[PDB]
Amino acid sequence: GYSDRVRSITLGNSTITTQECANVVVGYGVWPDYLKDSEATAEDQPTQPDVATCRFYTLDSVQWQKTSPGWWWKLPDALSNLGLFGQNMQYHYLGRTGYTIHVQCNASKFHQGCLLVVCVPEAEM
Amino acid sequence: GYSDRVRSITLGNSTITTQECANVVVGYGVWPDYLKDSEATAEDQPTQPDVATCRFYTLDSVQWQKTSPGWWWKLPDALSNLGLFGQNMQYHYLGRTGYTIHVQCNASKFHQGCLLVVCVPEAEMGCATLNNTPSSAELLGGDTAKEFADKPVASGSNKLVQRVVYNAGMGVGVGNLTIFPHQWINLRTNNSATIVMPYTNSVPMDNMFRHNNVTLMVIPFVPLDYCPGSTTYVPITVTIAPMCAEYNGLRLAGHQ
Amino acid sequence: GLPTMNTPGSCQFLTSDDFQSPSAMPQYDVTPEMRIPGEVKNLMEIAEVDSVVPVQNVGEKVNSMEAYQIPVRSNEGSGTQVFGFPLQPGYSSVFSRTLLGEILNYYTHWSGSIKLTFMFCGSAMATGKFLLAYSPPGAGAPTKRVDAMLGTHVVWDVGLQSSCVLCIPWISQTHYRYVASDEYTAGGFITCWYQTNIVVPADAQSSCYIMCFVSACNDFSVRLLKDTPFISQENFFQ
Amino acid sequence: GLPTMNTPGSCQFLTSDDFQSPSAMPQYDVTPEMRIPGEVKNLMEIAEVDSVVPVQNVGE
Amino acid sequence: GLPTMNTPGSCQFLTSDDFQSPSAMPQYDVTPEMRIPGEVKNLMEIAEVDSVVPVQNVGE
Amino acid sequence: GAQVSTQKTGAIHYTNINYYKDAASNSANRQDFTQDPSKFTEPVKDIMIKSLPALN
Amino acid sequence: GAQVSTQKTGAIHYTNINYYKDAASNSANRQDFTQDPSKFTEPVKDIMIKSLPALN
Amino acid sequence: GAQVSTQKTGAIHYTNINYYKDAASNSANRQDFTQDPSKFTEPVKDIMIKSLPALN
Amino acid sequence: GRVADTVGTGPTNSEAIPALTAAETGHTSQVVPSDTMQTRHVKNYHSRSESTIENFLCRSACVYFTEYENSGAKRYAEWVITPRQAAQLRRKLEFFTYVRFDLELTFVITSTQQPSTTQNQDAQILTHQIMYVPPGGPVPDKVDSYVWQTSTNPSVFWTEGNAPPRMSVPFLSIGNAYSNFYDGWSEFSRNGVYGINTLNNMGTLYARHVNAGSTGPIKSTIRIYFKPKHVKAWIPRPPRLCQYEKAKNVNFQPSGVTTTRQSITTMTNT
Amino acid sequence: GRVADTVGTGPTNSEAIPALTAAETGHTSQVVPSDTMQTRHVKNYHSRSESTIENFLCRSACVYFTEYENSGAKRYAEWVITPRQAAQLRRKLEFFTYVRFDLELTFVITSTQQPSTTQNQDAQILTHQIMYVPPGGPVPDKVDSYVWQTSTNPSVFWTEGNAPPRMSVPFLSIGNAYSNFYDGWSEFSRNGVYGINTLNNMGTLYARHVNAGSTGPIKSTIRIYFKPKHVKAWIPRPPRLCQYEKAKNVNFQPSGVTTTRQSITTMTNT
Amino acid sequence: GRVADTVGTGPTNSEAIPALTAAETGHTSQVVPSDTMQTRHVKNYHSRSESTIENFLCRSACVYFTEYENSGAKRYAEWVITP
Ligand SMILES: CCCCCCCCCCCCCCCC(=O)O
Ligand SMILES: CCCCCCCCCCCCCCCC(=O)O
Known part of the structure; x- marks a missing residue:
């Protein structure tokens, strides 16, 4: 027995379970990873906080109204005030990261609606 | 193809099919059975009515209301007026049995509620006043459900049982009753619940009228809450099937 | 007469001691065993069984069923706190009268993972x-x-499946922890926050309820048996 | 002196106990056994023997 | 009853003696050892460590 | 010169030794179970069979 | 007819002997550790798997 | 299940047995002589030789 | 016996959902802390020993005591044997519906002078007798009655200054185990005594002075101590909540579920 | 275990310099007396046995005592368990930062009459009870309180004239060893109690008479004796200098380094 | 030592008559309950131990007592031995 509606994600301490969802769109097809030593530049040894960094965060939930146009966040600076990933951001001149975004909006069966979650590299307004 | 939501039980003539349910909690893990000859005592040959006894019975369905505290039945004497299992109870000095309890309460998707079906071996109820003891008429009724009372019972000179729910009549925490086998009827994901009780008792066989060894309890934790316009009256129904009955020491007809 | 010397500790009566004593009724005959369902060989098999938690102790509701119920209601804004209680399974009033609560009170030390x-x-x-x-x-x-x-x-998300499991891991600077209240080893905290406000259709009831459970994982252990402060007495019962 | 510790229950007299005691008359000589008809090794062999029952207890 | 004779020195409490005693809390469970730096097995390993000498005690 | 025997159970060994020179000092023998009812029941010269009439 | 066993340690043997003829005189057995939680947890007929949904 | 060891002399054996089921009931161990001064004296990373100057 | 190991785990993304289940099945999830988070390999040497039944039920406990004197009205003390006249022992046995074990009795006897004007009181060593009377046997109504000869009934003679006496008793029940809770009557008409009081007939226990011991009055105190052994158990249940009331029945006085505290958010007891 | 041998040596002329070193390295020179002078071959049979930790810490010691009477205000004595209320034992444990060992308790109880005008006092043999209460347990406020039943808590019944009672206790600490010195607070705010007082919760120890024992008043004396066994130690340190003051903390009164003497040359103490 | 087993039996029709005998012979019939009715196979673990003579006669018993004083008429007690 199994189901495709259900998914469970675990990183570090946090865990996110969802009983209704679709598959997980992965990037352009490149699963995120560390830096191979062929492309490296910085000759100092890199810090790898791992569990201290990798985990899920939850930002401020925002209301959704009939006239609500939409929203945008900037990932590299959003978290900057949260957790060690905010601290380890201020004390280093370099960083390399990849993001798992998980958006949660639920409603009963009587609520119409459709949303669009896109993740846009280098959006220049 | 298959499903875990659906179950079909067949004993003797009767059959019970349910399209929404959970698994069947079996006892403490001992599937009921006959008596091996190592532990036997009675030297008369036992009667094994089988199909005449083993089958499902349906007692009186009882209404379930927003304020309804709960209910309890005594299994060894409930059926006593029903079927041959009521007859074969009166004509024997001994009996050995195990029970399959099946509780059925259904509701639409708009009805909140939660029930607790526990099966408590040897539930011994206290008394209203501290000195006396409960009368045989108050602890029991034929096929009829006795119900609790939500607030403390005033203590007079009567024999009344202490019906407060949060003490569950035994003077324990009601929140702890889950050590005994149980299941949760939940109007969300469930419809009916099921229990299988093997024979539990200190001695290998027992008299049926004297000693009521298995007590059934249904206690709502989350009352029934529904917006107006939906149907008001939701009954609960209980189904009780003996299993692998045996009897000894045929005697005259009666209890006295 | 084999020479011998008594040592300190003779002719004393110790409560917990192990010794052999002569039987008072020789060659008594014991009735044979029976096979009774549900044989406990160890108390730990009780400690893994679920039990309800009187999460709501507020006011005088402790005398009603509502002590076991957690109100959950649709708000106009998100981030409100559903409930919270400290983790002190032998002391804190929450777990005090629970199933796990009782077994602990007999023991001074414990460790494991509470689900x-x-x-x-x-x-x-x-x-x-x-x-x-x-x-x-x-x-x-x-x-x-x-x-x-x-x-x-x-x-955690509501849906077709119902039950959830939050497994509290074991994080402490010692191996065990006092079951009695002390500020040295104090356990931690637990909270529940609305992730997304309850959405309800029309004609369906607004307010819901959520019941909590407690159990001990298979790594649970206890030590140092003692008395339990709960049960009182005055003079011998009659 | 082998070290030792008395335990609770010393210097008590129990009615049913089993212990060895020193004989008060050493090397006493016992008369030989005889073969006597009707040797009971167990009381159960009495319990199988018939006996009359005072079934009528009425009055005097 | 194995015959026996107490010897002088019974029922005395000696400060330095070596004897076995019954445990007061049977089957208690002991926390495992840890590896702590600087384990002393003998006091002589303290006596080889240097220490300053108050050679001048004069006056106040 | 010890000896070993079995205790009385239902559902082990114990070590006993005789310390004295007189038989009457030895502990009681509780364990002799030998039984032959024939010396009280059935005291007849002609052996009678259960399955047959007594006086034929 | 002695016997040998192991004490309770953490990071040895002791010699015990039964001196009496009655089982109830033997010392307590503190060491039986056998445990099978399946008789309280998991009391279901259909064995359920952790890694799968409960109600499918 | 006895054991044998040596007493403390200068210029023999004794028989000990553990009678209890708990490690803490066993007699004290007086005889462990193991000694390694290196954990207080000579706590340096570079091993120094007696026959040579300290700071070269 | 040992605690299980906690096996390490890396990250996870997958459709298998350990963290979800349904408690409606009456099935406690077996999930271990490695499932819902990342975990390091850890060996646990903790042991469950002291949680076994044997170490739980086996401790001596004071069930009861009496007072009997050397002269006057009450010259002996009589007690029927029930564990339930002492609070803290009775509770430890109410977890388990059916219990099986072999009692080990120990008595502790003490003497006390009583205020009087009697002159030239000179003590002598007292001697206490303790007699057990299985059910139905003869019952002494007076200290010098013939029954004290104890032609059969197990009896113990004790002396002050010696060690406390001890005797062990095997399993005395008729059935296959003692029964703590019994629902039913003693009479086929469902009348008479209700509750466990019917099952319990253990006989009776007596004690007396053997000799007057002095001219002045002396009151004595006896104490009984159970120490269960070889225990077996069945069918555990919820611990008792409300305070006890009577020794013959489960009767209770209704009392709240727990203690209270302030508003749900409040993190401290009150 | 044995002392090392002193190996003989003849004269020496050479550039190897045993007699010189640098103590700035924090390195105690290993030089042996054969290096700086001529030495004869000598075998030493001296043994270091009695200097081992075991023989050093293992001796019985009187930590504390109380007084409780047979009548009046104080009918029982209560004491929390700390080694530090007795001077000479506490010092022997302050060499070692972290200690590990298994206590062996021994009590010594004595009785004493008290002056009174009561007439016709006739003694009887007293019986003392000693009850241990692990932390958080119920606390008796009166001698007849139910807690003395000791349904669980390890308890000892003792009698005058017998040998002193003894019981052994295993290692009770939570961590991997007891801690003699602890720098820190009990509260994350660095407030409240400071020092080792926070780590130490051992429970409590009680004692009482079982029976009045006579008409006249009687005062009793109890004494506790520790005897560490199986000892292990870590991280030695300097012995304490200034006299103790309080049992909860290291507080001291400033005092000189040593005693004094006359001018440096003077060869005798003063 | 152990109780005998009760062997099972089905129905019976036959000219052998266990249920009848003659007590005038001074002969206690050995009939076992399986003869006069139907019986199920049953193992008995009951033991006859405590009924043996040894356990029956062996218990201490108080045969007699006297009183003798430290001064006055009766300074010693004399008794002939009879049970
Ligand atoms: C001097 C001999 C003394 C013998 C002491 C006999 C005591 C019997 C103990 C019975 C034990 C606990 C039983 C509860 C009985 C019940 O309720 O069924
Ligand atoms: C009758 C039972 C008596 C039991 C005696 C228990 C005594 C406990 C001893 C603890 C030992 C020394 C510990 C110092 C504690 C600390 O400061 O951390």
Whole structure:
């Protein structure tokens, strides 16, 4: 027995379970990873906080109204005030990261609606 | 193809099919059975009515209301007026049995509620006043459900049982009753619940009228809450099937 | 006469001692064993059984069924705190009278992993999410969800399946912890925050309820048996 | 002197106990056994023997 | 009853003696050892460590 | 010169030794179970069979 | 007819002997550790798997 | 299940047995002589030789 | 016996959901802390020993005591044997519906002078007798009655200054185990005594002075101590909540579920 | 275990310099007396046995005592368990930062009459009870309180004239060893109690008479004796200098380094 | 030592008559309950131990007592031995 509606994600301490969802769109097809030593530049040894960094965060939930146009966040600076990933951001001149975004909006069966979650590299307004 | 939501039980003539349910909690893990000859005592040959006894019975369905505290039945004497299992109870000095309890309460998707079906071996109820003891008429009724009372019972000179729910009549925490086998009827994901009780008792066989060894309890934790316009009256129904009955020491007809 | 010397400790009566004594009724005959369902060989097999938690102790409701119920209601804004209680399974009033609570009170020391099982009893159509957080000590109970994030949290979702399992891991600087209240070893904190407000259709009831459960994982252990302060007495019962 | 510790229950006299005691008349000589008809090794062999029952207890 | 004779020195409490005693809390469970730096097995390993000498005691 | 025997159970060994020179000092023998009812029941010269009439 | 066993340690043998003829005189057995939680937890007929949904 | 060891002399054996089921009931161990001064004296990373100057 | 190991785990993304289940099945999830988070390999040497039944039920406990004197009205003390006249022992046995074990009795006897004007009181060593009377046997109504000869009934003679006496008793029940809770009557008409009081007939226990011991009055105190052994158990149940009231029945006085506290959010007891 | 041998040596002329070193390295020179002079071959049979930790820490010691009477205000004595209320034992444990060992308790109880005008006092043999209460347990406020039943808590019944009672206790600490010195607070705010007082919760020890024992008043004396066994130690340190003051903390009164003497040359103490 | 087993039996129709005998012979019939009715196979673990003579006669018993004083008429007690 199994189901495709259900998914469970675990990183570090946090865990996110969802009983209704679709598959997980992965990037352009490149699963995120560390830096191979062929492309490296910085000759100092890199810090790898791992569990201290990798985990899920939850930002401020925002209301959704009939006239609500939409929203945008900037990932590299959003978290900057949260957790060690905010601290380890201020004390280093370099960083390399990849993001798992998980958006949660639920409603009963009587609520119409459709949303669009896109993740846009280098959006220049 | 298959499903875990659906179950079909067949004993003797009767059959019970349910399209929404959970698994069947079996006892403490001992599937009921006959008596091996190592532990036997009675030297008369036992009667094994089988199909005449083993089958499902349906007692009186009882209404379930927003304020309804709960209910309890005594299994060894409930059926006593029903079927041959009521007859074969009166004509024997001994009996050995195990029970399959099946509780059925259904509701639409708009009805909140939660029930607790526990099966408590040897539930011994206290008394209203501290000195006396409960009368045989108050602890029991034929096929009829006795119900609790939500607030403390005033203590007079009567024999009344202490019906407060949060003490569950035994003077324990009601929140702890889950050590005994149980299941949760939940109007969300469930419809009916099921229990299988093997024979539990200190001695290998027992008299049926004297000693009521298995007590059934249904206690709502989350009352029934529904917006107006939906149907008001939701009954609960209980189904009780003996299993692998045996009897000894045929005697005259009666209890006295 | 084999020479011998008594040692200190003779002719004393110790409560817990192990010794052989002569039988008072020689060659008594013992009735044979029977096979009784549900044989306990160890108390730990009780400690793994679920039990309800009187999460709501407020006021005089402790005399009603409502002590076991957690109100959950649709708000106009998100981030409100559903409930919270300290973790002191032998001391804190919450776990005090629970099943796990009783067995502990007999023992001074314990360690393991406590599971918390939650079950959503609300209407079948209404849905919702919740954030179950555990904040190890060192700071007060977090008063804003953003602060609860930095703990160990399981975002949990209502749906076709019902029950959830929040497994509190074992994090402490010692191996065991006092079951009695002490500030040295104090356990931690637990909170539940709305992840997304309860959404309910029309004609379906607004308010729901959520019941909590407690159990001990298979790594649980205890030590140092003692008396339990709960049960009182005056003069011998008659 | 082998070290030792008395335990609770010393210097008590129990009615049913089993212990060895020193004989008060050493090397006493016992008369030989005889073969006597009707040797009971167990009381159960009495319990199988018939006996009359005072079934009528009425009055005097 | 194995015959026996107490010897002088019974029922005395000696400060330095070596004897076995019954445990007061049977089957208690002991926390495992840890590896702590600087384990002393003998006091002589303290006596080889240097220490300053108050050679000048004069006056106040 | 010890000896070993079995205790009385239902559902083991114990070590006993005789310390004295007189038989009457030895402990009681509780364990002799030998039984032959024929010396009280059935005291007849002609052996009678259960399955047959007594006086034929 | 002695016997040998192991004490309770953490990071040895002791010699015990039964001196009496009655089982109830033997010392307590503190060491039986056998445990099978399946008789309280998991009391279901259909064995359920952790890694799978409960109600499918 | 006895054991044998040596007493403390200068210029023999004794028989000990553990009678209890708990490690803490066993007699004290007076005889462990193991000694390694290196953990207080000579706590340096570079091993120094007696026959040579300290700071070269 | 040992605690299980906690096996390490890396990250996870997958459709298998350990963290979810359904408690409606009456099935406690077996999930271990490695499932819902990342975990390091850890060996646990903790042991469950002291949680076994044997170490739980086996401790001596004071069930009861009496007072009997050397002269006057009450010259002996009589007690029927029930564990339930002492609070803290009775509770430890109410976890388990059916219990099986072999009692080990120990008595502790003490003497006390009583205020009087009697002159030239000179003590002598007292001697206490303790007699057990299985059910139905003869019952002494006076200290010098013939029954004290104890032609059969197991009896113990004790002396002050010696060690406390001890005797062990095997399993005395008729059935296959003692029964703590019994629902039913003693009479086929469902009348008469209700509850466990019917099952319990253990006989009776008596004690007396053997000799007057002095001219002045002396009151004595006896104490009984159970120490269960070889225990077996069945069918555990919830611990008792409300305070006890009577020794013959489960009767209770209704009391709240727990203690209270302030508003749900409040993190401290009150 | 044995002392090392002193190996003989003839004269020496050479550039190897045993007699010189640098103590700035924090390195105690290993030089042996054969290096700086001529030495004869000598076998030493001296043994270091009695200097081992075991023989050093293992001796019985009187930590504390109380007084409780047979009548009046104080009918029982209560004491929390700390080694530090007795001077000479506490010092022997302050060499070692972290200690590990298994206590062996021994009590010594004595009785004493008290002056009174009561007439016709006739003694009887007293019986003392000693009850241990692990932390958080119920606390008796009166001698006849139910807690003395000791349904669980290890308890000892003792009698005058017998040998002193003894019981052994295993290692009770939570961590991997007891801690003699602890720098820190009990509260994350660095407030409240400071010092080792926070780590130490051992429970409590009680004692009482079982029976009045006579008409006249009687005062009793109890004494506790520790005897560490199986000892292990870590991280030695300097012995304490200034006299003790309080049992909860290291507080001291400033005092000189040593005693004094006359001018440096003077060869005798003063 | 152990109780005998009760062997099972089905129905019976036959000219052998266990249920009848003659007590005038001074002969206690050995009939066992399986003869006069139907019986199920049953193992008995009951033991006859405590009924043996040894356990029956062996218990201490108080045969007699006297009183003798430290001064006055009766300074010693004399008794002939009879049970
Ligand atoms: C001097 C001999 C003394 C013998 C002491 C006999 C005591 C019997 C103990 C019976 C034990 C606990 C039983 C509860 C009985 C019940 O309720 O069924
Ligand atoms: C009758 C039972 C008596 C039991 C005696 C228990 C005594 C406990 C001894 C603890 C030992 C020394 C510990 C110092 C504690 C600390 O400062 O951490």
